[PDB]
Write an enzyme that holds these catalytic residues in place. Structure first.
Site, PDB file in Angstrom:
ATOM      1  N   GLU D 194       7.363 -51.780  46.502  1.00 53.96           N
ATOM      2  CA  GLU D 194       7.791 -52.556  47.915  1.00 53.96           C
ATOM      3  C   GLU D 194       9.126 -52.416  48.346  1.00 53.96           C
ATOM      4  OE1 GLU D 194       6.326 -56.432  47.935  1.00 53.96           O
ATOM      5  OE2 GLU D 194       7.437 -57.205  46.575  1.00 53.96           O
ATOM      6  N   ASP D 195       9.675 -51.093  48.585  1.00 48.09           N
ATOM      7  CA  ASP D 195      10.923 -50.642  49.072  1.00 48.09           C
ATOM      8  C   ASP D 195      12.074 -50.611  48.097  1.00 48.09           C
ATOM      9  OD1 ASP D 195       9.487 -50.413  51.267  1.00 48.09           O
ATOM     10  OD2 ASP D 195      10.385 -52.131  52.271  1.00 48.09           O
ATOM     11  N   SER D 196      11.723 -50.635  46.803  1.00 49.22           N
ATOM     12  CA  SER D 196      12.581 -50.578  45.887  1.00 49.22           C
ATOM     13  C   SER D 196      12.516 -48.874  45.337  1.00 49.22           C
ATOM     14  CB  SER D 196      12.450 -51.454  44.615  1.00 49.22           C
ATOM     15  OG  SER D 196      13.333 -51.057  43.531  1.00 49.22           O
TER      16      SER D 196
END
Ligand code: F3S
Ligand SMILES: [Zn+2]
Ligand SMILES: [Zn+2]
Lengths: 98, 176, 86, 196, 258, 90, 113, 122, 66
Positions: D194-196
């Protein structure tokens, strides 16, 4: 866009049969809902550009070379046309099943 | 006094179920769901070394039992490994999220692993996906486990079984 | 049915049960007065943690605390609950 | 015709509006009108031919010479009401009046750096333009003798391997703001969720 | 339990290991990166620097320059047992007169003559007119577990041992294999480079019944590539010695507790 | 390295080692899995930002867990010595 | 007509914004323009919500559950004779149900059903 | 507790990727089909084999197919026949009978059983 | 600004192959053939040379006085 979650040394990174290690790992779950195909296309084009030493133009509607020619040339230079690699785990040494 | 109140009333695992509706607000996300599906599918076979690698990220120490397959080669099953963490009197019957399409059979006789069957804490059928472990899904298997065994059990389950899914994705390889 | 059957069930249920607010209040008071110099009512020689809140929690779990909860009902009736060995 | 022959100013635009009720002619010659150039075609034949292109490639003429010869004209939004334009030369018809010079000239300078932008969803192309103005690289060759309140400098900048035609025109290959990374798409250790 | 040489080509060494567990071979692969000592620049003392590059940039560039360390592992103290016998000094004093001047690795002067840069043609910095640099660096042994500048290799690979068998005959196998394992010799399919097979299995989705692909269970292939500081055969021995040291220390601490 | 015992019995041992990582943990787990009498063996790295591992051994009682660990260390040492001997003659 | 590329009075699907390509195959220039036009109104996408929540908080902040089971204000006014209708907390509910009887049956005899 | 001699009739693919279904025809109007994968595929489509289902561990070698699971299902059909299902921790063994496994008082619900199939060509 | 000493991905030294490569490519040779002759076989090391921008040449005209 994203933020750095962890930094991993080269020994712990997964490596290909040639010993190449990724600089950045991207999660496959970020692509399907955002529908950015240009990023996968750019990855393939960049691998082709590095392998062949030839220019890659990605101007909209007028892209040269085409993707299929890029994949055939990638195959002729010693890599899989679909831009996939056989990968081993750096922590254990075991080959991934995919 | 402030620290004691914060530790007694505001701790995270005591607030798994939201007050807006009777459902869990804490649960699995993106790699958790696909890892659970890939591990719990009926084609997954494991060796002793792979089982020890998967269980090394958890707190589990003990006897694995006999492998599900003894001959021609000794193989464990993903369902068999998952069953090590379910309570030995838990029962659940219900459909899986993957049962939206033609693979839905609406009964226990399903060749697609679309119907979940748990008897005495043994996963005998079905897969794990968003409708079994996903967050904000009321009346799911995880919700019933938390409700009937306590939020401490939910904390223990989320800290042990959800790591196995990530480890199995690492071993299997998941790309696009 | 004094007022309603649900109210009778409610008061019968909470007759010999502690609410979470009462547990929190008891633990906080015990920890505060234990950090002020009071002597623990348990062994406190082989406990995992030696902070006041953990000792208060263990003292509440095994009834040794001579504390009484006073519940005042809105009509004036008073109920007393003892946590010393129940 | 008078404007195309050099007897009228190029700043004058004319539109003819014909309707079941209206019969009007509009002439505009003031400032502040946003115009774009187009190739003039006549009977299905553009006025820019092989000889003009050959003289352009070896440096004898320029864009301004083609404009002054009546082969390319800038038209405003109201003169374009009478225009029937073709994107590509191979779909020209005797009914067409103009031809597009460059179909990718509908974008700006930052949307012109995206590789394969027509394969992406549009909001991501919009977010790219915002994020491209916040990246660190070389902003000036004489940065060491300037006095800016805040400034950054990437130590080892690289130019992209996947290029666009506008990157070399705007000078971005000489002042780059990024680097080429070996990228893997896989799930690993759960630290990229999730967006890392 | 033997070891067979595949190829020795410059800085690359390729071996076949039989009857060794994969855990040991991967531990060797990791230790050859993490636990082999190498001479490298530790800190730099700057007197003057007019170059376009800052002091930290030049220090990092100097620290990334390899040095020959083969004789330094017996005359210098490793970082595990921490001045003379610990550090070495390298000097650099250059200046440009009227036109730009490029500084290379041959301009570095070492006080000890057995510790020299691997290559003398590495560009350090470009100087403008009248710019000058004079610095002094100190070199010491270290492990790649502390900083990757102390690693002696570039790639370190262990992969499975392939078994390629031709069952029938098909021209698609030569077309689809990216490693060139097959070839056509007199109108039939033959295996030329079996050991180059990476178990891609791309041949099995076209020549499904003509080719068989397996992996040998007890054999592994080990590739390492040196960077210049040490020869490939010394690295593989130093890694095993480090493993032995760690194992012996752990065993002593275990036996001193029962 | 610095070691300490988390929980020890005759047929169970949980050992924490500070200053070690995958290189020793994976080798020790693989060596333990081939010691006769060991029922379960695994290693854990609790946080990638910390250089520390935990070894977990369970036996059937015919051998002690500490004895099994020492035997695994001996096996690893034999392999390392044989590798050193064989590399010198290629 | 939306664009100068199309004829006067043309209302065919391609002239008014129908895209027949996929992202895998790529969009045409005017198809890209139409796609960018369709998604413009999602870019625009709170004070009203904050004001409503603040008004609710200031209206309801003084209500309490008593040992009687009654909902009363801190000034003594009775709001509900018993909370809800069965005095069941929504946080402890089986998704708004005090008890799910089918779940209890499955708990008891689910291993043979 | 339940033996037999029987011949394999078909080996199809099934719903999932690597799944395989081995259909079999037995004596006493018995039919058995079970799931396998590529690792366990050691059967040809027209061979004679012997099976056994029992609560005790049988004697097996490296050339047999042995597994253990739980008998967790039994349904009666319209014609009076029974459907029995054994789950080898996920791999399903389906048995077609006219009297059933539990209705005939051979096994109980949720018994732990051992399933072994051996080749008649010893 | 100036060519990196090592490849970012692996630890191979690339800085000493920049001058021959750039000199021969501007002389009219094929970049792939030059890279293969120089011994640069992995694409991680080839992107290092195929994408370097020599900016220090422009910067030496504007160095800070100090
Ligand atoms: S296509 Fe290529 S490298 Fe190996 S397994 Fe199949 S041969
Ligand atoms: Zn189905
Ligand atoms: Zn490289």
């Amino acid at each position: 866009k994203g933020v750095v979650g962890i930094l991993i040394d080269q020994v712990d990174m997964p490596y290909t049969a040639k010993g190449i290690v990724p600089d950045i790992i991207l999660n496959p779950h970020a692509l399907p809902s955002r529908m950015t195909i240009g990023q996968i296309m750019e990855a393939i084009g960049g691998k082709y550009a590095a392998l062949s030493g030839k220019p890659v133009d990605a101007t909209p509607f007028l892209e040269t070379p085409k993707l299929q020619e890029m994949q055939k040339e990638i195959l002729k230079l010693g890599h899989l046309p679909d831009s996939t690699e056989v990968v081993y785990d750096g922590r254990t040494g075991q080959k991934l099943k995919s | 006094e402030a620290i004691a109140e914060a530790r007694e009333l505001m701790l995270v695992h005591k607030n798994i179920i939201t007050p807006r509706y009777g459902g869990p607000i804490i649960g699995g996300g993106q790699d958790y769901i696909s890892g659970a599906y890939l591990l719990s599918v009926k084609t997954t076979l494991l060796t002793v070394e792979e089982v020890a690698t998967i269980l090394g990220v958890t707190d589990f120490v003990g006897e694995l039992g006999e492998p599900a397959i003894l001959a021609p080669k000794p193989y464990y099953t993903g369902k068999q490994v998952i069953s090590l963490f379910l309570p030995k009197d838990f029962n659940f019957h219900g459909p899986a999220n993957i049962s939206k399409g033609p693979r839905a059979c609406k009964d226990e006789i399903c060749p697609h692993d679309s119907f979940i069957v748990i008897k005495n804490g043994l996963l005998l059928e079905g897969v794990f996906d968003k409708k079994a472990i996903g967050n904000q899904q009321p009346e799911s298997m995880l919700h019933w486990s938390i409700r009937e065994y306590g939020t401490e059990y939910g904390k223990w389950l989320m800290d042990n079984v959800f790591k196995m899914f990530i480890r199995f994705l690492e071993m299997r390889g998941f790309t696009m | 049915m004094t007022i309603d059957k649900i109210n009778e069930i409610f008061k019968e249920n909470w007759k010999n049960k502690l609410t979470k607010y009462e547990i929190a209040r008891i633990i906080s008071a015990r920890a505060l007065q234990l950090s002020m110099g009071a002597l623990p009512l348990i062994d406190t020689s082989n406990l995992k943690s030696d902070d006041v809140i953990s000792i208060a929690e263990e003292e509440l779990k095994r009834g040794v605390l001579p504390i009484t909860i006073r519940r005042i009902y809105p009509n004036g009736q008073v109920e007393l609950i003892s946590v010393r060995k129940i | 015709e008078s404007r195309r022959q050099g007897k009228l100013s190029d700043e004058v635009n004319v539109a003819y509006i014909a309707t079941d009720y209206l019969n009007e002619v509009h002439i505009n010659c003031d400032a502040g009108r946003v115009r774009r150039p187009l190739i003039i075609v006549n009977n299905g034949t553009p006025l820019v031919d092989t000889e003009d292109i050959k003289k352009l490639k070896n440096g004898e003429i320029t864009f301004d010479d083609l404009v002054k010869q009546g082969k390319i004209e800038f038209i405003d939004a109201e003169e374009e009401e009478n225009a029937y334009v073709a994107l590509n030369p191979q779909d020209l018809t005797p009914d067409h009046t103009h031809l597009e010079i460059w179909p990718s000239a509908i974008l700006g300078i930052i949307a012109s750096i995206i590789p394969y932008p027509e394969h992406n969803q549009s909001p991501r192309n919009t977010y790219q333009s915002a994020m491209a103005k916040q990246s660190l690289g070389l902003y000036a060759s004489n940065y060491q003798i300037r006095t800016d309140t805040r400034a950054h400098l990437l130590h080892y900048p690289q130019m992209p391997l996947v290029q666009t035609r506008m990157l070399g025109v705007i000078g971005y290959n000489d002042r780059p703001a990024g680097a080429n990374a070996i990228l893997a798409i896989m799930s690993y250790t759960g630290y990229n969720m999730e967006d890392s | 339990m033997p070891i067979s040489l595949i190829e020795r080509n410059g800085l690359r060494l390729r071996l076949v290991l039989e009857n060794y567990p994969l855990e040991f071979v991967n531990s060797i692969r990791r230790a050859s990166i993490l636990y082999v000592p190498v001479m490298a620049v530790d800190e730099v003392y700057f007197i003057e620097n007019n170059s376009p590059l800052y002091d930290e940039i030049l220090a990092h560039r100097l620290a990334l320059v390899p040095f020959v360390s083969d004789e330094a592992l017996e005359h210098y103290r490793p970082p595990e047992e921490c001045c003379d016998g610990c550090y070495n000094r390298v000097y650099l004093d250059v200046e440009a007169k009227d036109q730009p001047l490029m500084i290379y690795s041959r301009d570095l002067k070492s006080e000890d003559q057995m510790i020299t840069p691997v290559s003398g043609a590495i560009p350090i910095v470009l100087l403008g007119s009248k710019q000058k640099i004079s610095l002094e660096a100190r070199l010491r042994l270290g492990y790649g577990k502390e900083h990757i500048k102390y690693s002696p290799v570039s790639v370190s690979i262990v992969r499975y041992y392939p078994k390629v068998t031709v069952l029938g005959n098909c021209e698609k196998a030569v077309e689809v294999c990216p490693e060139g394992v097959f070839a056509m010799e007199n109108n039939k399919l033959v295996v030329k480079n079996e050991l180059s097979c990476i178990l891609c299995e791309e041949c099995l989705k076209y020549c499904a019944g003509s080719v068989s692909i397996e992996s040998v269970e007890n054999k592994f292939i080990l590739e390492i590539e040196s960077v210049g500081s040490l020869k490939p055969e010394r690295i593989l021995i130093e890694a095993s010695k480090s493993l032995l040291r760690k194992l012996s220390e752990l065993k002593s601490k275990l036996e001193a507790g029962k | 390295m610095e070691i300490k015992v988390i929980k020890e019995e005759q047929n169970y041992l949980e050992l924490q080692i500070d200053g070690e990582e995958h290189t020793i943990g994976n080798l020790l787990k693989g060596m333990l899995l081939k010691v006769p009498g060991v029922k379960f063996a695994a290693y854990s790295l609790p946080h990638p930002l910390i250089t520390s591992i935990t070894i977990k051994i369970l036996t059937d009682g015919s051998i002690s867990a500490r004895e099994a660990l020492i035997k695994a260390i001996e096996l690893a040492e034999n392999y390392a010595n044989l590798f050193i001997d064989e590399v010198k003659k290629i | 007509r939306t664009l100068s590329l199309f004829k006067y009075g043309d209302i065919a699907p391609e002239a008014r914004g129908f895209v027949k390509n996929s992202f895998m195959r790529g969009l045409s220039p005017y198809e890209m323009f139409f796609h960018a036009a369709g998604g413009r109104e999602g870019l625009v996408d709170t004070s009203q919500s904050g004001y409503m929540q603040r008004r609710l908080i200031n209206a309801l902040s003084d209500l309490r559950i008593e040992y009687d089971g009654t909902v009363r204000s801190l000034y003594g006014d009775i709001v509900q004779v018993v909370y809800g209708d069965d005095a069941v907390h929504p946080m402890y509910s089986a998704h708004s149900k005090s008890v799910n009887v089918n779940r209890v049956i499955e708990r008891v005899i689910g291993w043979k059903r | 507790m339940m033996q037999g001699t029987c011949k394999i009739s078909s080996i199809e693919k099934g719903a999932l990727k690597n799944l395989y279904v081995v259909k079999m025809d037995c004596d006493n109007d018995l039919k058995i089909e079970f799931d396998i994968t590529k690792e366990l595929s050691i059967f040809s489509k027209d061979e004679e084999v012997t099976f056994i289902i029992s609560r005790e561990k049988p004697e097996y070698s490296e050339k047999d197919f042995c597994a253990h699971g739980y008998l967790f299902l039994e349904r009666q059909q319209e014609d009076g026949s029974f459907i029995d299902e054994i789950s080898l921790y996920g791999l399903i063994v389906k048995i077609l009978s006219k009297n059933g496994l539990i209705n005939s008082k051979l096994f109980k619900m949720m018994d732990h059983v051992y399933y072994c199939v051996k080749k008649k060509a010893h | 600004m100036i060519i990196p000493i090592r490849c970012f991905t692996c630890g191979a030294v690339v800085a000493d192959k920049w001058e021959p490569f750039s000199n021969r490519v501007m002389g009219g040779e094929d970049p792939e053939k030059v890279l293969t002759e120089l011994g640069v076989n992995r694409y991680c090391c080839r992107r290092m040379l195929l994408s370097h921008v020599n900016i220090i040449r422009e910067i030496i005209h504007y160095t800070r006085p100090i």
